[PDB]
Structures are given as structure tokens and as C-alpha cells.
């Protein structure tokens, strides 16, 4: 266990220098957040809103299950996996299945994320054998991907462009977005090398 070892090193350091410094907390924030359970929970909460009887949803379910198992094995990197996930999410078949599950009313997504937590426990997709149920509780009681009505985190990178155009007011109407260098006075440290994002301010 490297996380308990880093916690032991944090306790020994905080007892040594008798203050809460910036180095040790950054070290244990980097150790406790090395897990890829976020993307596995993304794929499994996308699998939860599907239909176990429809063959198209069976194809999407097996595709996202293979994607999550390839992420947990370390054979596929995170960026290409995110490309695969956003290509599977932006398809109109998955969005139509999510709309049908919204129009149902007695939706099976709660049993979906519960079986997802059981699968992540059984297949070893977590760091601790009982951490998936606390992560399920965290997905339920907080604003997350599980409370979204379509089953993905609500960023504009996971929503279609033809729905992005009439809603949002971006730079010019009728990829990586940048500030053009005509703005010589944008902010204090803002410039052309500072990227901007459509639906969020990451600053």
C-alpha cells in the first residue's frame, strides 16, 4: 500500500517540522489522486443509462466495458480513451437511449450504478476492495455524472456541436480555442498563450 505509506510519511513529516507545510500535502494529494477510478466511473455511469434488452445498447455497453477494462489495465492511455469515450457518448443512438430512459420514469440507472460498483469491486477496478461503494455514495449525494439526466459529466466536450451552436455565445458564429493577439489588454496575465474554454472557466 503506497497511499498508507505516503500517509505515514505525511504524519512523520508533520510531527517532525511541527507545521502543515505545502510540500507534504502536495505529495499526499498526488498519491491519493493517482487512481484511474474517475474514468472507470465515467464509463460505468454511461453504461448505467443503457437498456439491457436492446442490441444497440448491448454494443455500446460492451464497447464501454472494454474501454474501462483497457484503462484499468494500463494498456490504453487516458487521452485516447477520452477520445473513445466522447465518440461513444456523442452518438445519436446513445442520446436516444438516454432520452428513452428519461421518458420512462421508472429508470434502471440506480441498479445500473449499483451493479457497476459491484463489477468494479469484483474485477479489481479500484484501489481498495470497498472503495467503490463509497465512490457510488459520492456520485449519488453530490453533483456528479450520475445525477446528469444523460449519464455523462455535463461539459460541452461531451455534447454535440449542433446543440452547442444555438445555446452558447462564443467568439464567432455564422478544437483548441485561443485568444487572438489583437487584445493587448485582456487581463493582468492573460495573453495569446492563454487558452479559453467554451462552457467552463478553469482559472
Amino acid at each position: 500500500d503506497t497511499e498508507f505509506q505516503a500517509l505515514v510519511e505525511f504524519i512523520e513529516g508533520a510531527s517532525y517540522d511541527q507545521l502543515i507545510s505545502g510540500r507534504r500535502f502536495k505529495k499526499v494529494y498526488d498519491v491519493l489522486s493517482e487512481n484511474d477510478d474517475m474514468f472507470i466511473w465515467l464509463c460505468h455511469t454511461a453504461m448505467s443509462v443503457l437498456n439491457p434488452g436492446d442490441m444497440r445498447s448491448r454494443l455500446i455497453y460492451n464497447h464501454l466495458r472494454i474501454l474501462a477494462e483497457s484503462v484499468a489495465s494500463g494498456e490504453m492511455t487516458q487521452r485516447t480513451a477520452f477520445r473513445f469515450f466522447e465518440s461513444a457518448v456523442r452518438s445519436p443512438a446513445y442520446r436516444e437511449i438516454a432520452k428513452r430512459q428519461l421518458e420512462g420514469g421508472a429508470a434502471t440507472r440506480l441498479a445500473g450504478i449499483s451493479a457497476a460498483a459491484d463489477v468494479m469491486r469484483r474485477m479489481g477496478l479500484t484501489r481498495r476492495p470497498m472503495s467503490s461503494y463509497f465512490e457510488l455514495y459520492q456520485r449519488i449525494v453530490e453533483r456528479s455524472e450520475a445525477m446528469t439526466p444523460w449519464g455523462f459529466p455535463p461539459l460541452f466536450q461531451f455534447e454535440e456541436r449542433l446543440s452547442l451552436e444555438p445555446r452558447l455565445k462564443f467568439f464567432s458564429r455564422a478544437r483548441i480555442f485561443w485568444i487572438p493577439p489583437t487584445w493587448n489588454r485582456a487581463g493582468r496575465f492573460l495573453g495569446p498563450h492563454v487558452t479559453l474554454y467554451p462552457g467552463m472557466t478553469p482559472d
Binding site: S33, M38, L42, R143, I176, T195, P202
Partner: peptide
């Protein structure tokens, strides 16, 4: 800046800190 817009990979949309800022 045009070479940065041309050659660089697309940014990662979601992270753990993004999940905490969403919550």
C-alpha cells in the same frame, strides 16, 4: 501560436479536480 493550435493534442476534458469543482 498557430503552431500551438496546429500540433498540440486536444485537452483532457474531465479530471478529479474537475469533478470536485463540479461538485
Amino acid at each position: 501560436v498557430a503552431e500551438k493550435a496546429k500540433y498540440m493534442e486536444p485537452p483532457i476534458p474531465y479530471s478529479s479536480l474537475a469533478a470536485r469543482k463540479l461538485a
